[PDB]
Design a protein around this ligand. Sequence first.
Ligand SMILES: *C/C=C1/C(=C/C2=NC(=C\c3[nH]c(/C=C4\NC(=O)C(C=C)=C4C)c(C)c3CCC(=O)O)/C(CCC(=O)O)=C2C)NC(=O)[C@H]1C
Length: 481
Amino acid sequence: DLSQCDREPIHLLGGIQSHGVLLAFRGPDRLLEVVSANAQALLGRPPETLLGQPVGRVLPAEVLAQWEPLVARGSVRVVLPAGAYRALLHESDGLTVLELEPAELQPGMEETALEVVRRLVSPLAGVKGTQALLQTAADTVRALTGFDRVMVYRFDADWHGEVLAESKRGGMDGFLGMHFPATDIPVQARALYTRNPLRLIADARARPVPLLPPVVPALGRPLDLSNSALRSVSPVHLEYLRNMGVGASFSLSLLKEGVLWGLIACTHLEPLHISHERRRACEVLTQLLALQLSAEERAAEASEDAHRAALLGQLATAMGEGGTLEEVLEKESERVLALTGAAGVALLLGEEPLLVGCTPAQDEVEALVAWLATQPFQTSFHTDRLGTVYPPLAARADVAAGILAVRLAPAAARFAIWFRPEVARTISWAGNPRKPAEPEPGHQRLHPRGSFQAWEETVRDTSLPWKRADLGAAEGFRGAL
Ligand SMILES: *C/C=C1/C(=C/C2=NC(=C\c3[nH]c(/C=C4\NC(=O)C(C=C)=C4C)c(C)c3CCC(=O)O)/C(CCC(=O)O)=C2C)NC(=O)[C@H]1C
């Protein structure tokens, strides 16, 4: 992909976080093949001397005595000398990978989890706007995690993001409404998070624990840690969190109708571990928000549709109430523009264009009509930045930053073109986006940027996007012309 942020193979770093232990076994004798260098944390004896041993001679009796439900469920609670641990299994590179990490200590967590689910599945939830949905999603995740700050972060069209909503304890500073470059979460990070929706950085300042040996010897590269709960993250991102003053981090992928829409990102000023079962509870809340968002969006799409269907009906009644088509369209100007949420429309019904609302002058309409007759667009053409593809109108963002054109004749140049002004938006970046990272001379190390202080730009010359109901309304109005 684009830069070297994207090139770091974050699933192949060969380290796990220090609060857990990892063990990987091969073949039917279950021979210890990959083990973390801290494995004495939970194995009585030094890990390098257990490379090669069958699992019955490696693992504590405790874990062994739970081996059956472990194998069949992929997850079980074990009570070690060192406390209650949560043991997880998965498969990677032809190995069975056992991960142990401290287990949930509150017997009532799940009970607490069901109560915050209620807040978010609630009878008529999200009824005071989807902003209120985002806030409640932030509120319930922080209520359940104890994280100092919880945010809802949304990826925009170019994969830079913005904070839509924030929930934070009193005195925490936040980033509500701020924008962040796409490189802050690079492309191979976003692909990993599409397949693994959860990740915890329990202590941003702790050192990664290496795996032994540093390659899986069959393959000659490190063990793949894509599906590991204990995967230690890219050192650059740990530096990023240090620069933010963040001691611990936990984020959840928001997948909406197949694709990565955003994250629920949590941060804490001190280290903080969240149990595997408490993070699975937070995942239920994220899927719940994604469900509520989809439901609310489809409903909005449906209600908008009915509005445009009401309109063409009111225009149909209006025609055939007397007069010519140009006559009734002129009187029904407001409805004609409403169909696509436009400020103006030019109709080429044969002769010189009929100009309704604010449109460019007659001559600019004639030039554009002649140019649209050249392009390939089947039946309808639309853009929200006319000026990047049609320079003669590039300076008239006041009346024609976006257009929506429909063909009224096969080879002839007959069209309805709706126009939209620009919509200026003043955005605050968290840091200077022209300098999204501080590379070392020679560009081999790379470091995060040093400051996240507000940096303001106004985006000009672009209209509100054309909505699906806009294109539907226009297609339906071609018949009447
Ligand atoms: C040149 C490389 C860069 C880089 C690398 C990077 N970032 C990664 C993960 C990650 N970044 C964020 C960003 C944010 N956290 C916030 O709170 C906000 C806004 C308020 C932002 C924009 C997040 C949330 C994550 C996910 C991990 C987490 O802490 O929850 C990764 C992948 C880490 C991994 O191993 O998975 C990489 C490689 N960041 C840069 O800024 C540049 C320099």
